[PDB]
Every structure is written in structure tokens, then in C-alpha cells.
Amino acid sequence: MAAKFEVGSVYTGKVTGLQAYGAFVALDEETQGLVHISEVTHGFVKDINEHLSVGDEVQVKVLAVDEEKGKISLSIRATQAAPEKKESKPRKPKAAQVSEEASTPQGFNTLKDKLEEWIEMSNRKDLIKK
């Protein structure tokens, strides 16, 4: 068929399917590859939908190329492990949110156990005691 990529390269594409053995990703109008499930995440890939999403954009590492069909074997554990530019990008704002980013209802972050009770109230400061 054709090829225009090489092993060890890294490029960005969109997920075109998920399977019990891997995720299809379109890289280009002329190139489409397969993140193998063993390459979606480092281990404990209990189900692929817990680790990838169809109809989403992903950056993939080229593991192998198959010019016979223009297929490519891909990784995502490679790219999720890699660093990136620590600057804003269009979806870093996480505009899909519909609530405040608070970890708890009682305050922005209020993790506890000794008073893991109430929902819109908390104990006063100890200074309440006179």
C-alpha cells in the first residue's frame, strides 16, 4: 500500500474505535493504526474504555509500520508517560465541567474521617469553647 511514518516517531490523531485487544486511531486520511491494549497503559488494563475513549484526540507513538496495508502499531503508555509544554491549550480549561472543582461539598477540599459526617455544615473552630 503506502507509508509516510517511521518507528519511534510521535504524532497526533483521533480514536476511531475500541476493542478488547486495542484502540483504532486515525492518524491521517491515508494512515490508520492500532494501539495494542498492552500499550494503552503500563499494566492493569482491565478494560480499554477505562483508559481511552472513541471519538477523542490522542497523541500516539509509532511502534511499527506495515506498508503492506498502511497500518501502524501504536502506543499510548509511551505518550502518557512523556512530558509536554507546561502552557495552556484549548482543552486544559476542561470546559466540559458543570460544577466547581471542589473535592468535597463541605469546602473546596475537606477530606477527613473523625468527622466524616454532615454535607453543608462543619464543626466550628475550637475557639467556640470558652
Curated annotation (Swiss-Prot):
One of its GO terms (molecular function) is nucleic acid binding. PROSITE patterns: S1. GO terms for cellular component: cytoplasm. Transmembrane segments: none annotated. SMART domains: S1. Residues 76-109 are annotated as: Disordered. It holds the Pfam family S1. It is found in: Cytoplasm. Residues 100-109 have a biased composition (Polar residues). InterPro entries: NA-bd_OB-fold, Ribos_protein_bS1-like, Ribosomal_protein_S1-like, S1_domain. Induction: By heat shock, salt stress, oxidative stress, glucose limitation and oxygen limitation. It comes from the Bacteria. Keywords: Cytoplasm, Stress response. Found in association with the 30S subunit of the ribosome. This is General stress protein 13. It comes from Bacillus subtilis (strain 168).
